[PDB]
Amino acid sequence: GFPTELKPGTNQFLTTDDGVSAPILPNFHPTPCIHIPGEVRNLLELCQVETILEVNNVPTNATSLMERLRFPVSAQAGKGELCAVFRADPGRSGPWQSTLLGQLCGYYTQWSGSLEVTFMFTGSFMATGKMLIAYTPPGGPLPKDRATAMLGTHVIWDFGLQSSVTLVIPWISTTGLVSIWYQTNYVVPIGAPNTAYIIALAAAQKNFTMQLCKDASDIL
């Protein structure tokens, strides 16, 4: 009635709208809110939790899934390469779609920040040896041996420390590569198991975040 004509496009219906509707029950009183020990604020803190990562993917049998998530180590192999973790890109298929970080990033398009990983060793109390962690920046060719990787940012493993070995990637945004190499041969005392299995952990840093949502779904 009051003189004012709204510009055309009054009844457009887009999902993003910040519209409020009249309640179907204008007299109901909602149940009181309680305090629960659990609490969630954003997706950032959920990315700040640690979760396991997988390397080996050779066997596919149903009763054989466990030896996928861990990779073996033997004393016979020396001065070479044990395992080469696939390219660093959590959104795409590879290592990171198994962990929580990649899957939640699966609901997003692009991301930027820094990533860090920590490594845990499961050898005997009487065992000793030396290990190498190799990181190469994107763009650079494939590593050849321990010497070429040692030129760049590398982490050397000491068995005087149990799991203090950790790596931090300054920036991630075509993709970087990380690998593991034998700095020295594996030596074991007599009367001890001749082989062990290795596991690793991963998480997200403070400055890691996503920007835009993606409509991605696979199953079902």
């Binding site: 390219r87 660093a88 990181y135 920046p137 760049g152 970087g176 590569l177 690998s179």
Partner: protein
Amino acid sequence: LTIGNSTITTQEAANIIVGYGEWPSYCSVNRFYTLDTKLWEKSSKGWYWKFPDVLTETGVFGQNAQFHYLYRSGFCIHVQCNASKFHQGALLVAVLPEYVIGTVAGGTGTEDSHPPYKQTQPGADGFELQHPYVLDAGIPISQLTVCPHQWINLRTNNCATIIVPYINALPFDSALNHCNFGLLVVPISPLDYDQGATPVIPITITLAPMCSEFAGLRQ
């Protein structure tokens, strides 16, 4: 700063020109680069250069700059054109940011595949403009002066300088991945001289960046 016996005779009376009245910035040195002399002829039409990819072969720190990814420096570009007192000519020097090289698609069918490596690599010497009116890119030569430039006249001066900071497509910039800029030199009035005189005019360009960065990544 001499490589054995490299002590050239340099000018001390350069004409100082500032760019936008703004000095370069910090993270977001005394080596003077030397290039091969250029010969200017009566029928010459002008040249062009592409940085930093072609720059990584002439400089002493430029040769190492092939392996350096990022840059952090200020550019003091010196262009020198020595000539006699009774020579005639005119030259234009300017910098064109984001200068995309225009490929030529001739023939009966107006369609070509990905740019050939022959066109992408003219060498460290430089290349000649096929049709310098459009800078071989369909861009009129009349409009270069809107960008920073300098007028070089034989009757007036023999040298000029240009100072430009780093302007890139992204706040985080890569020098070995993204082509930054280039230099354009084109004659406006063809050079004339008396019969029997020296027919070759030397051109030298000098720049002195500060430093670059290695970077590097691992898997």
